Amino acid sequence: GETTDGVYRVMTRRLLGSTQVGVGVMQEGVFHTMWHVTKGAALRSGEGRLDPYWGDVKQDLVSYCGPWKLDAAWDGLSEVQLLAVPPGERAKNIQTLPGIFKTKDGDIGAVALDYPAGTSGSPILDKCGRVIGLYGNGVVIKNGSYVSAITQGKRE
Amino acid sequence: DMYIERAGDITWEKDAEVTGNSPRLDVALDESGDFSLVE
Numbered sequence A: 001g002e003t004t005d006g007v008y009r010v011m012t013r014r015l016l017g018s019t020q021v022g023v024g025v026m027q028e029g030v031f032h033t034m035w036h037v038t039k040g041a042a043l044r045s046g047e048g049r050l051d052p053y054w055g056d057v058k059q060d061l062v063s064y065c066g067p068w069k070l071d072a073a074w075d076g077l078s079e080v081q082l083l084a085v086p087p088g089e090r091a092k093n094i095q096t097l098p099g100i101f102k103t104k105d106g107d108i109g110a111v112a113l114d115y116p117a118g119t120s121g122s123p124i125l126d127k128c129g130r131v132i133g134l135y136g137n138g139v140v141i142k143n144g145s146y147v148s149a150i151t152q153g154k155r156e
Numbered sequence B: 001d002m003y004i005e006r007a008g009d010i011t012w013e014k015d016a017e018v019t020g021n022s023p024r025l026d027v028a029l030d031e032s033g034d035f036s037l038v039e
């Protein structure tokens, strides 16, 4: 059905009422979201169906209808915007300067903004509006707040 | 069954609410895609 570019909510009628389990990006006919949102399950878009095409539990990413299309990267210097789409609430741009996740295999950008788990898959943008990653996979620091990585896939 | 609903356009917003800090954390990524703090 709806394949127009944009940010979308991922809903389920399985639990009580309609519950938002996550968010995703539609770009070039491909829906991009985090693996933990759908678990690789099929998705519905009105009367149409979206079938998983690529996915990886370790990266925590999944694409529907085609290969991962998003390949912009954080420059390691500039402020970014989390286009947060929280459950039952309007989409809203939040500007922040990312921190750093230091790993044994290199450093990753990290946005320190606290949002409900159902906000997972919300895009992080550069000043050009290009998607540099998705919010939803990170860690819980000492006080209980969430610090998420700027998770990006690979455009083959 | 899961379904998608449009929520908006992907554009940078000039004069958006600026918040959040920039922390440097030593983390570890496991095979299940879960990050954990290494201190």
Ligand SMILES: Nc1noc2cccc(C(=O)Nc3ccc4c(c3)CNC4)c12
Pocket (backbone or CB within 6 Å): A036, A060, A115, A116, A117, A118, A119, A120, A135, A136, A137, A138, A146, B032, B033, B034
């Ligand atoms: N625990 C959270 N507190 O605030 C959040 C905001 C967004 C997301 C989460 C979260 O739980 N993410 C997640 C869930 C399952 C998995 C992964 C990541 C990666 N592996 C499987 C949270």
